[PDB]
A = this chain, B = another copy of it.
Amino acid sequence: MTLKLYSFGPGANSLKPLATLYEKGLEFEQVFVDPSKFEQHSDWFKKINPRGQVPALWHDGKVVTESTVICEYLEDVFPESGNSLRPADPFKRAEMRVWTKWVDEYFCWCVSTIGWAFGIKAIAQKMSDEEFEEHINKNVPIPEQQLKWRRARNGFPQEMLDEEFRKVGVSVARLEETLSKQDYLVDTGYSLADICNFAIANGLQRPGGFFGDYVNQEKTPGLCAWLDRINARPAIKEMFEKS
């Protein structure tokens, strides 16, 4: 392979370039970095990405990081491969970037914060207390992430959780505002905007889940039809089938 993707599979930030690769029909080696073994903190992976986070794209010896950047990189380099995922119209491509950067600056983080608090409790508590601290202190380069791991194992402040939940509500209302009126986030059709937002939103509609009161047929029919729509796409089904 001349293209390799290092990631956690199809969820959160990893899903963005994974979906992009399958939508564009690009051949690549799908490398699973196993979070249950903290492989993102392994010496061999930090050689690929010294930040110690996924996703990371390897292309002919060059490493591209940041999920949103990798997707734009794939469109910059393979504009003629499979589905075209940025509008040709520059005004529509601008609108697309407003959506993708909003995922990076707002939507991903409130959902993620709730995920760190409740979602990876088992990984977060695998090691003994000192073994945990040993790993964090010498193998997690990123300070903001050191604190997140500590709070994942030991607890997030309550008022922090309350605020994060409110922002999820804001985020879901914003999506519904648009998706209740059109099929995709930019009206030129399916784009990186949909992919980046789907990366965060897919799973929120789970009955009995964390956000069932926010995302459902009654409150957000637009959002739900969009989630269904993207999940019906052949490349998205292929992504989940082969992961």
**Selected contact of A64 from candidates B59, B77, B94, B170, CB within 8 Å:** B94
Instruction: Determine if A76 and B90 form an interchain contact, defined as CB atoms under 8 angstroms apart.
Output: yes
Stretch at the interface among A26-34, A65-73, A211-219: A65-73
- Evaluate contact between B101 and A72: CB separation under 8 angstroms: no
Q: Is A98 among interface residues, defined by CB-CB distance under 8 A?
A: yes
Mask of A84-109 contacts with B, CB within 8 angstroms, 1/0: 00000011011001100100110000
Q: Nearest-CB distance from A136 to chain B (Å)?
A: 18
Q: Which of A124-161 contact B (CB under 8 A)?
A: 143
Asked if B170 and A69 sit within 8 Å, CB to CB, the answer is: no
Main secondary structure of the interface of A (DSSP, over half): helix
Q: How far is the CA of A98 from the CA of B66 in the complex (A)?
A: 7
Is residue A62 contacting chain B, with contact meaning CB distance below 8 A? yes
Q: Which residues of B contact A77 (CB under 8 A)?
A: 90
Tell me how many residues of A have a C-beta within 8 Å of chain B.
23
Question: Chain A, 158-182, contact with B by CB distance < 8 Å: what is the 0/1 string?
Answer: 0000000000001000000000000
**Chain A contacts with B in 48-74, Cβ cutoff 8 A:** 59, 62, 64-66, 68-70, 72-73
Cα–Cα distance between A218 and B76 once the two chains are bound (Å): 40
Taking a contact as CB atoms under 8 Å apart, the answer to whether A97 and B66 are in contact is: yes
Q: How far is the CA of A233 from the CA of B77 in the complex (A)?
A: 31
Question: Contacting A91 at CB < 8 Å: which of B62, B93, B94?
Answer: B62
- Is B101 in contact with A101, judged by CB distance below 8 angstroms? yes
**How far is the CB of A214 from the nearest CB of chain B, in Å?**
16
List the B side residues contacting A91 at CB < 8 Å: 59, 62, 64, 73
Q: How far is the CB of A57 from chain B (nearest CB, A)?
A: 9
The answer to whether A68 touches B101 (Cβ under 8 A) is yes
User: When chains A and B are docked, how far (Å) is the Cα of A93 from the Cα of B105?
Assistant: 20
What are some 18 contacts across the A-B interface (CB < 8 A)? A62-B91, A64-B91, A64-B94, A66-B97, A66-B98, A68-B97, A69-B97, A72-B94, A72-B97, A73-B90, A73-B91, A76-B90, A76-B93, A76-B94, A101-B101, A101-B104, A104-B104, A143-B170
Give me the 3 closest cross-chain CB pairs, A-B, nearest first: A76-B90, A73-B94, A69-B97
Told that A73-B94, A101-B101 touch, could you supply 7 new A-B pairs with CB distance under 8 A? Answer: A62-B91, A64-B91, A66-B101, A68-B101, A72-B97, A73-B91, A143-B170
